[PDB]
C-alpha cells in the first residue's frame, strides 16, 4: 500500500508546483498590465 501511495503522492507534488508556477505567472502579467496602463495614464492625462 506504501508502494502504491508513493506513485500518486509524487504526481501530486509536481502538480502543486505547476499550479504555483501558473499563479505567479498570472501575478506578474497582471502587475505588468497595471504598470503599462499606469504609465499610459501618467504620461498623457485625460480624466473628465
Amino acid at each position: 500500500c506504501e508502494a502504491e501511495d508513493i506513485a500518486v503522492y509524487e504526481q501530486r507534488l509536481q502538480q502543486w508546483h505547476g499550479e504555483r508556477v501558473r499563479l505567479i505567472q498570472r501575478e506578474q502579467e497582471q502587475r505588468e498590465r497595471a504598470r503599462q496602463d499606469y504609465e499610459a495614464r501618467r504620461a498623457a492625462k485625460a480624466s473628465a
Binding site: A43, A44, K45, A46
Partner: protein, 59 residues
C-alpha cells in the same frame, strides 16, 4: 410687382399695439443688455473650458 414698382413696402401689422412708454422702453433696453452680457459670459466660460480640457488631454 406693384410693391416693387411703386416702391411701396408692405409691413405686417404688429400684434399688440401698445404705447411704448418711458418705463417700459428703459426696462426692455436693460433686459436686452443683460441678456447679451449673460450669453457672452457663457461663451467665455466655454472658451476657458475647451482650452483647459484640451491642454489637459494633450499632456
Amino acid at each position: 410687382k406693384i410693391c416693387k414698382e411703386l416702391g411701396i413696402e408692405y409691413t405686417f401689422p404688429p400684434p399688440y399695439h401698445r404705447k411704448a412708454h418711458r418705463r417700459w422702453v428703459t426696462k426692455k433696453a436693460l433686459c436686452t443688455q443683460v441678456f447679451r452680457e449673460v450669453q457672452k459670459l457663457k461663451k467665455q466660460k466655454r472658451a476657458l473650458r475647451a482650452a483647459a480640457v484640451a491642454a489637459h488631454k494633450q499632456g
